[PDB]
Amino acid sequence: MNNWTEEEVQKVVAEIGKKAAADPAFRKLCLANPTGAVKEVSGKDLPQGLKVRFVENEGAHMTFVLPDPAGSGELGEEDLNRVAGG
């Protein structure tokens, strides 16, 4: 399993919305490195094996980042659109 709890994730996502709205550059950060943006908010590193993705809400055009459900069938295989470095 991961080290990130559901409560933490929800809080981070909310703060991502706040920061992305306040600063478009943060939205760009989320796009450039979703997990980096999460670390910026939470101050924690990505649990090894935890796959993370992001979505855009319209027409707000805000980027939100959240980890995939741990223990799910979703594979952690590197995707073509996966940010190098982790």
TrEMBL record:
What superkingdom does the record give? Bacteria
Q: What is this protein called?
A: NHLP leader peptide family natural product
